[PDB]
XYZ file of C-alpha atoms in Angstrom:
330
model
C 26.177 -50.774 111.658
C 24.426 -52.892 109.430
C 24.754 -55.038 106.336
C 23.018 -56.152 103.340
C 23.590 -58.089 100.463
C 21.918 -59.502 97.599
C 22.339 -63.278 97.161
C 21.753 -65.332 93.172
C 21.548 -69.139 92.517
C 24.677 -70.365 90.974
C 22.089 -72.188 88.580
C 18.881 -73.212 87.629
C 18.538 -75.926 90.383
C 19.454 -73.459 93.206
C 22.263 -75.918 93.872
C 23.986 -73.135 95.739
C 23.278 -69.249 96.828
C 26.635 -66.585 95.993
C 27.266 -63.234 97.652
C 29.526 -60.535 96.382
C 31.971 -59.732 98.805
C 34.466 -56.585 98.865
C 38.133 -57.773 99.954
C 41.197 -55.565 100.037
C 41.844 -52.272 99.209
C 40.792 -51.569 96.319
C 38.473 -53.769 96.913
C 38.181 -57.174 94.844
C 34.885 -58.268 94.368
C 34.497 -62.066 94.840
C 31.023 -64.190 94.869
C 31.263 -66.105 97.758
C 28.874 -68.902 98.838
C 27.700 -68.145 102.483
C 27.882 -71.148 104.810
C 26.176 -71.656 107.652
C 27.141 -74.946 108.050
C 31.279 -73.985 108.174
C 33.587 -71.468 109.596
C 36.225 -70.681 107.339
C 36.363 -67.577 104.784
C 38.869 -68.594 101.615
C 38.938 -67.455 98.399
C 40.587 -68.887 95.228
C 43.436 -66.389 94.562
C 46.800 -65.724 93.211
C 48.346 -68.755 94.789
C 46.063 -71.196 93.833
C 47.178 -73.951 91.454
C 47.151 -72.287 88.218
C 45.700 -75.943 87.046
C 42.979 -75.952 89.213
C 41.730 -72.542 88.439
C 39.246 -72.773 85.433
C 37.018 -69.473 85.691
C 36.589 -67.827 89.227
C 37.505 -64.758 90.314
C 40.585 -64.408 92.616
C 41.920 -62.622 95.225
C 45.603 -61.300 94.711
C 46.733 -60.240 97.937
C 49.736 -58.663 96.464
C 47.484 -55.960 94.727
C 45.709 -55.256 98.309
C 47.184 -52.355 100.450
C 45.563 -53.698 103.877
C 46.538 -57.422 103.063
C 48.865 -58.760 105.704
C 49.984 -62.563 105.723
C 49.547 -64.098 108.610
C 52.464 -65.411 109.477
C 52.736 -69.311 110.039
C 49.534 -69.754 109.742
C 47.649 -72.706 107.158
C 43.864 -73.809 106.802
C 42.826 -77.296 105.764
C 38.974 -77.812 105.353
C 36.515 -80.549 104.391
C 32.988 -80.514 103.343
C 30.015 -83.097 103.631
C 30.311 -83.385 99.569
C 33.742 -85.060 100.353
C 35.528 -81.266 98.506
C 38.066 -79.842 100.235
C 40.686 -76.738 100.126
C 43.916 -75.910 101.782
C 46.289 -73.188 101.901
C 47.669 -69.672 103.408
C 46.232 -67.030 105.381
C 46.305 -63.257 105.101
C 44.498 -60.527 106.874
C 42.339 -57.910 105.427
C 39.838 -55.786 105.190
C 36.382 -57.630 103.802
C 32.760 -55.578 103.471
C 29.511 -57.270 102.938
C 26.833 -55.346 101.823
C 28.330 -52.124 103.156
C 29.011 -53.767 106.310
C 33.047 -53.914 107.150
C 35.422 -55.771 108.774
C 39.036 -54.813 109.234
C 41.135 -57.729 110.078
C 39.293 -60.545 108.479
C 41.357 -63.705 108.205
C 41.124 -64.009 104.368
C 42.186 -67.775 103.695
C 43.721 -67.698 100.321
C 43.876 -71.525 98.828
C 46.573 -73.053 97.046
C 44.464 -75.937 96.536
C 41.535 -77.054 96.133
C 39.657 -79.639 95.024
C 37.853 -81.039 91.475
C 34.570 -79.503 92.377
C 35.642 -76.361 93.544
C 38.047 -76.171 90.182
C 34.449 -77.448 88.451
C 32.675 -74.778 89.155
C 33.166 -71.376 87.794
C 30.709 -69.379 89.456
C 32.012 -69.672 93.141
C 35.026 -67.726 94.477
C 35.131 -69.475 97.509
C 33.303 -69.475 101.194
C 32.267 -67.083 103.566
C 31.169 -69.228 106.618
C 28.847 -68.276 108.944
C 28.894 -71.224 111.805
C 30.501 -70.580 114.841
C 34.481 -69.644 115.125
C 35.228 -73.113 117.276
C 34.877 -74.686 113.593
C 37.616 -72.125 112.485
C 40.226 -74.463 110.381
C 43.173 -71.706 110.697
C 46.022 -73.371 112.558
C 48.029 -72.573 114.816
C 45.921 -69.851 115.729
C 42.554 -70.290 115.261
C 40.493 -67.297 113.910
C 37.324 -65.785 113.893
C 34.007 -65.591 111.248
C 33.123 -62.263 109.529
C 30.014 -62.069 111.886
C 31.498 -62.954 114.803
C 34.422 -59.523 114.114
C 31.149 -58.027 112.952
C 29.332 -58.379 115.636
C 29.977 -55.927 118.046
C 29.725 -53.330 115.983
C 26.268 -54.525 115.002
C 23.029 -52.664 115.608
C 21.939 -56.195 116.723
C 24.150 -59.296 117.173
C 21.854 -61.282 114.326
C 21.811 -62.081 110.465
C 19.135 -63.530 108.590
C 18.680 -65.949 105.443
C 16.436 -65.186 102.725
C 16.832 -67.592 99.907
C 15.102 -67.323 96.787
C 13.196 -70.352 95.191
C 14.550 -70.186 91.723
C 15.614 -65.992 92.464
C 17.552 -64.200 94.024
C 17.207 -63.425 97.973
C 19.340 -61.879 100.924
C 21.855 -61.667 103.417
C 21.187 -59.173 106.259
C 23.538 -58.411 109.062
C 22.355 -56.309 111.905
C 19.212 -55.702 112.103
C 15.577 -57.432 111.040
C 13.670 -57.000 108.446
C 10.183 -56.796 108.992
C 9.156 -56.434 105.687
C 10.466 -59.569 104.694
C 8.709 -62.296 106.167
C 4.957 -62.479 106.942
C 3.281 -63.303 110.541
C 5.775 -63.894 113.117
C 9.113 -64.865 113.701
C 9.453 -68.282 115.986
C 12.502 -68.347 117.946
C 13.904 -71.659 119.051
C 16.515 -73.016 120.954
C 20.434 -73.313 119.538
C 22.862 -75.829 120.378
C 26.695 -74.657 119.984
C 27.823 -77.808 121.231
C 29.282 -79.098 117.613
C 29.741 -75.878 116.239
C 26.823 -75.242 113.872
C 23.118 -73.633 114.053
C 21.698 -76.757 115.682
C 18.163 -76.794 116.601
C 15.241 -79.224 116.887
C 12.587 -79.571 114.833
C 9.253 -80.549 116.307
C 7.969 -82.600 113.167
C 6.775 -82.790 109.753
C 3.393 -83.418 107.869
C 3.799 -84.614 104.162
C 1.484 -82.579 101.941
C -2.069 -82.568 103.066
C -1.479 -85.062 105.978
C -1.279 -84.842 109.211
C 1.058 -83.520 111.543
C 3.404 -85.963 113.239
C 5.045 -84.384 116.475
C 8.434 -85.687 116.724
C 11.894 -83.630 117.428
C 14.084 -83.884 114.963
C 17.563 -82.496 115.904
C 19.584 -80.950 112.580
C 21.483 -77.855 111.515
C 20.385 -74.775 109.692
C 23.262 -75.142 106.425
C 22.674 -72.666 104.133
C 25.770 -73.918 102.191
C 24.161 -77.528 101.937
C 21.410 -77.869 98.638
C 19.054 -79.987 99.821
C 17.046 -81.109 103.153
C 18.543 -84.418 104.559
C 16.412 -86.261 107.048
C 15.766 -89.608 109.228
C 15.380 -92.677 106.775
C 11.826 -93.086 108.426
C 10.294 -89.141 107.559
C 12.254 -89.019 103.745
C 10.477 -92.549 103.330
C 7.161 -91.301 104.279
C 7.544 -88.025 101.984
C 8.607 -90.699 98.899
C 6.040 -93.167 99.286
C 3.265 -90.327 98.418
C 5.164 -90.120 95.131
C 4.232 -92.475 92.829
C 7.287 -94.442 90.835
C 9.658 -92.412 93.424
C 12.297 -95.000 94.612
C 15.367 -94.687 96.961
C 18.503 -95.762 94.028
C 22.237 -96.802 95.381
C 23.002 -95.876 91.542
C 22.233 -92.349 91.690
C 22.887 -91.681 95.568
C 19.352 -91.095 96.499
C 15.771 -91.118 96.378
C 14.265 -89.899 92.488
C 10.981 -89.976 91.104
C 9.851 -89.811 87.830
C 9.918 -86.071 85.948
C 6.490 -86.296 85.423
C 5.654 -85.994 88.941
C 4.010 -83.517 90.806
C 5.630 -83.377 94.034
C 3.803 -82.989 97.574
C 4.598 -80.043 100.168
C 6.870 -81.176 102.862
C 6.115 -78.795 106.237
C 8.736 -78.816 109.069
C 7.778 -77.601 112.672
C 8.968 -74.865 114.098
C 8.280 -74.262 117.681
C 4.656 -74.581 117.325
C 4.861 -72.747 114.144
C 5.039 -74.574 110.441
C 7.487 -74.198 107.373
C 5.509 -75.446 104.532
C 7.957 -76.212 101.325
C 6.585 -75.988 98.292
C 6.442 -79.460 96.555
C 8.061 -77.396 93.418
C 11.387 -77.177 95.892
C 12.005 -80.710 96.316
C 12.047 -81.019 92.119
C 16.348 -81.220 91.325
C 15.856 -82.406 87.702
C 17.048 -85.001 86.182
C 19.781 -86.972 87.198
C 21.202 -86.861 83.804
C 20.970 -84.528 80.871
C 17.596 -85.712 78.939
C 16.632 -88.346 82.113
C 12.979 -88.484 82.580
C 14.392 -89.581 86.584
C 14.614 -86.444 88.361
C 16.339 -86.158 91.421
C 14.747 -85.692 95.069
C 15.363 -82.602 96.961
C 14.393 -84.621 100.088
C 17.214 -87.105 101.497
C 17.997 -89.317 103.831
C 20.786 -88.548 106.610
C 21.184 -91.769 107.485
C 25.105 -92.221 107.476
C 25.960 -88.163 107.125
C 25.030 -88.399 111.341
C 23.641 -85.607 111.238
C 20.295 -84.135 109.902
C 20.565 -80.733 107.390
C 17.934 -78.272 107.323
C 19.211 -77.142 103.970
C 18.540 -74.453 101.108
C 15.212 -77.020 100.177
C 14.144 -76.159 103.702
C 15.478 -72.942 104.547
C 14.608 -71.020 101.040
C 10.818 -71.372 102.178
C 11.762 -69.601 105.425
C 12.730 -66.137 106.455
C 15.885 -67.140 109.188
C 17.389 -65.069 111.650
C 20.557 -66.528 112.945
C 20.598 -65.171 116.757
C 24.116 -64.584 118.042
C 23.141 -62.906 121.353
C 25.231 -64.531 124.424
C 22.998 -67.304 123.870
C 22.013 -68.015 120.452
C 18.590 -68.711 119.147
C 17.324 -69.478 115.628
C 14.459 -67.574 114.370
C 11.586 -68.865 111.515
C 9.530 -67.252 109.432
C 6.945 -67.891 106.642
C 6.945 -65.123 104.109
């Protein structure tokens, strides 16, 4: 079998990427944001804090013919933004682009937290990292790809992000119409759960090519491209008026910028990102200080190869017996 699905910006800054998702029977369409940086599905829903529902679509297991609860078991989940959700669990049936799962653990939240409440346009989180991340307690349980997998013509799915537009989510197969040249395949580290790989280096517009491996995680549910202090300073300083501010939380530059290309190595391939990418706005309504798509990690402990890096990539997420990560330009 295979899947595909069409994924939108939540808004104009391509802060995040959502997904309709079919859950129950008949189904209930939710827009999901698909995370490759997490491992839990939940949805807002019937039992969520009437108060901290303001907008998004939810899932009312009661209405569902092929919900089950899951009996005893919770979910409790944190995310690098410092938002979090908690609740129930319930199994049912969840299809993704007419691909289906029967069985999904559906994690239905009876809280969650300002942000989520904040923002309207997402129904919840479909992750995509590997199970051992899996919040559900005391059993835990497994991803939508990984009960999808078998059943898959091949054991992959692949990221295309749209810059400003709309992309996809394929499950199953490759396609080769999507991407130009070839694919580079590199190597995957399970160890902490994610889509961890290692970069061999960057160049900062024009310049050169610095060879250097960079170890981070593919996260399509993270916005932007966090880095070692040393690389994001380098990109900066080729910005004139840019500055890293403890105000704001970051490196901005002034609106009036044009921004270099930022080029990651693949392999011995190259990801070039637009310059336009790394442009977040301004940090305030009517700010002529915009806000740098290009961060430092230093402190997360962990380098993100975000949507700013992986929306100028076509990105197969290999989950043969040994997983691999595959790049493309297109």
């Amino acid at each position: 079998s295979t899947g595909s699905a069409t994924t939108t910006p939540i808004d104009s800054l391509d802060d995040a990427y959502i997904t309709p998702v079919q859950i129950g029977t008949p189904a209930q369409t939710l827009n999901l944001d698909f995370d490759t940086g997490s491992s839990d599905l939940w949805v807002f829903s019937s039992e969520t804090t009437a108060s901290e529902v303001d907008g998004q679509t939810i899932y009312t297991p009661s209405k569902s013919t092929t919900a089950k609860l899951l009996s005893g078991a919770t979910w409790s989940i944190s995310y690098g933004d410092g938002s979090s959700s908690s609740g129930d669990v319930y199994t049912d049936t969840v299809s993704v682009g007419g691909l289906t799962v029967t069985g999904q653990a559906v994690e239905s939240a009876k809280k969650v937290s300002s942000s989520f409440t904040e923002d309207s346009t997402i129904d919840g989180l479909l992750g995509l990292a590997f199970s051992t991340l899996n919040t559900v307690s005391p059993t835990q349980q497994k991803t939508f790809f990984d009960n999808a997998k078998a059943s898959l013509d091949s054991p992959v799915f692949t990221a295309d992000l749209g810059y400003h537009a709309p992309g996809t989510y394929n499950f199953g197969f490759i396609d080769t119409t999507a991407y130009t040249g070839s694919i580079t395949y590199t190597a995957v580290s399970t160890k902490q759960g994610f889509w961890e790989w290692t970069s061999t280096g960057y160049a900062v517009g024009s310049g050169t090519f610095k060879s250097t491996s960079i170890d981070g995680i593919a996260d399509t549910g993270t916005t932007l491209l966090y880095l070692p202090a040393t690389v994001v300073s380098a990109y900066w300083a080729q910005v004139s008026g840019a500055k890293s501010s403890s105000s704001v939380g970051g490196y901005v530059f002034p609106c009036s910028a044009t921004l270099p290309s930022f080029t990651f190595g693949v392999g011995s391939a190259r990801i070039v990102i637009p310059g336009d990418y790394i442009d977040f706005g301004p940090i305030s309504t009517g700010s002529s200080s915009c806000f740098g798509g290009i961060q430092s990690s230093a402190g997360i402990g962990i380098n993100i190869f975000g949507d700013v890096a992986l929306k100028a990539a076509f990105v197969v997420f290999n989950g043969a017996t040994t997983p691999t990560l595959g790049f493309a330009s297109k």
